[PDB]
Amino acid sequence: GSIGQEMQMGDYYVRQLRGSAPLINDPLLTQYINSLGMRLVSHANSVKTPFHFFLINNDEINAFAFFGGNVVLHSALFRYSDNESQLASVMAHEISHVTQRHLARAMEDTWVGALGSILLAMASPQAGMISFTQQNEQEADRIGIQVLQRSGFDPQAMPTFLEKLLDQARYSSRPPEILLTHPLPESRLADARNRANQMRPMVVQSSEDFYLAKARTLGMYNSGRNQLTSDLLDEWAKGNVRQQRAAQYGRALQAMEANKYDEARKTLQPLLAAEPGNAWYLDLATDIDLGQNKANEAINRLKNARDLRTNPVLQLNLANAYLQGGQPQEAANILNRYTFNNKDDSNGWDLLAQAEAALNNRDQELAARAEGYALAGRLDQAISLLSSASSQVKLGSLQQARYDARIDQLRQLQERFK
Amino acid sequence: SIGQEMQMGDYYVRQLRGSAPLINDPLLTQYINSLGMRLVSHANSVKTPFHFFLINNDEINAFAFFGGNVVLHSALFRYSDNESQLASVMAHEISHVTQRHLARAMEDQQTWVGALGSILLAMASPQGMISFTQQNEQEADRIGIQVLQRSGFDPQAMPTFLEKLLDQARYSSRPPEILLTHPLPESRLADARNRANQMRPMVVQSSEDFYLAKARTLGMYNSGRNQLTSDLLDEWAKGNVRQQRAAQYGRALQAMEANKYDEARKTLQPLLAAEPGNAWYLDLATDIDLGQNKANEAINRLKNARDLRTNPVLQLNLANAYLQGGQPQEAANILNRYTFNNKDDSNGWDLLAQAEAALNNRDQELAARAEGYALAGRLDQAISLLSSASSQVKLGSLQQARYDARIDQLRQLQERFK
Ligand SMILES: [Zn+2]
Ligand SMILES: [Zn+2]
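Structure tokens for the assembled complex are given below, as produced in the milestone run.
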């Protein structure tokens, strides 16, 4: 089965990505990027596979995708994206590469590892490299702009973003890495500007989650050219009030990053007072609270949250608060259900490992950190942890049957690829 | 060329003394050289003696020049959370001199000797400034962290300090002056983390001398942002027993500063009862006693110390107590030996001048004042004092020839440099 092979070929590369590339595993940022991405996929034609959207800590702008609906976005995209529709146009562009099976159809002409080595070199700040035909790039722009429009974004954002890539391709000695995987001749641009001119004029406003995502990405995961500049923060202090709340949020982050917690708490207060129930400031409200060993206050606030049952960001934030507060069992009650509902989330497993370690449930601790190692492609290491777990439980027990069964599953993943 | 550089270094420190606000406090200068020499003893290819100087400046900086003279702004105690962070900065400077970066940089150019000295004085004064290449900073970090671990300090304290500097260069509009002299691009920071990660984890607890030094620097020599705040003392009151004793010391110190002598005695009492031979507590107990016109009690406590013949802090403390007690002859006997064994310590020369003033030995007072002026680079003034001293003694006397001989030496020192 091609779709079956593609989905597990994708899982193999995604596991290699987690284990060696610097992915941003932050709950707020990953939930936003996937919520935005899924909103595009839900308006794409002939989607035959699930989709996941990954974020790299890389200041070089690039974007690419491979089998299984897995698209990779560098954090530099938030530095170049002035509006949400520009970032959406890049994801729409990459989503269309997958639906058209461009990378899959290009490979029909040691080889599984040859492609995986290319994928991580493009994602790592340590950079072979894949390239699409300019015909392929035209289909991705043609199909991407229509997904862009049906999703309620500005179609003129795609040519506007392409032109900003061209103005740095000659006003700078460095060709941005995105232009080498996705080449941009003026024909590509003039074709894009023409299509946008022929759709409906639409002025769209970037969501409030976009500016907060842009602030957290550049502020909290700053790296190289990926900074949250004071020039941009002061510029956001003059724009629409969404950018001002985002600008306030960004300085609260940097005040927390520099351990000026009371300075950060007092900056964050007015935004939390206006929106007491949104996850973005709730997330940092606990972060500053635990920075001062006020874990009870973080717990009380999160138990009063409306959407604690539905929002994973809230669920992890409270589990972490229970851990720092000295109640690991309450953290485990949340995380046992959390890890079962999000088996691919390594944040959940790592926190469960912490909770089970604090409870001195060593077999369950080893099994929890085994899942972290399995998600990172460290299957030999995951098997070692579950072997140790299975050696601490009586034979014939279900814990032994379950630990040994999980080892069996990881061995099958292992033999499918060399 | 070592002979030229060590006499040229003497000229610069004389220029520093005369214009920069140096902290000459016996305990602090002894501490910073105790720890500095501890790093030199583990350094390679050391060709020079080493002296470390502390400038009362709330802007963080550090630099070094010819003759193994390292200059450290007192702000370093505000940024240093542990003793190994402080040593990491000192090892960086010691690495600058053993590589002779400033010497090799100045061999390229060739008047000039004074242009470098004006730059050094401007950097030291709170208020044209030397900066190193990226090659120099890499060498100073790589070599420095190896010295830092040979000395038993935490190697991860170097990358942790560097990122602490960057973390408040983005939080504030102010970039720390340390990062202007010692540029910190992210390549350097990534390199520092790399070399530290290659070495094994080391949990070292700071000496109790570090916390008392930090307490005395920020509490007695407070200035601008350098403050011993109640926030700091509360956190030390909650920390380990060394921080608790230092918090007790700092509060006793500030009570003494505010003339709350009886309150200061009750606060220092448990620390001095615990170790009656500790120089930091013996020093403070003297200030408290002299503040209440209790010289006899101060004299008797310091005569009972084991290290009176060995510790320069106790010697100066007891000489000053004898001064306030109306026994200037006994002060002079201590200081005549001290100034002979410590020719470069300006404290000994000043207290000797006070003792000779108290004994009405005018020419001997003037000659002692002259040494203080000569150490501060004010050679004409020192010659003026020795000339007047020579005019109060008989021609052909032994005193006349010595005063005239030292005038000859000082003038001979004047023509070597401009
Ligand atoms: Zn493309
Ligand atoms: Zn340096």
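The pocket of zinc ion (ligand 2) is lined by residues B 92, 96, 132, 137, 140, 182 (CB under 6 Å). Chain B touches chain A through six residues (CB under 8 Å). Further analysis is deferred to the final report.
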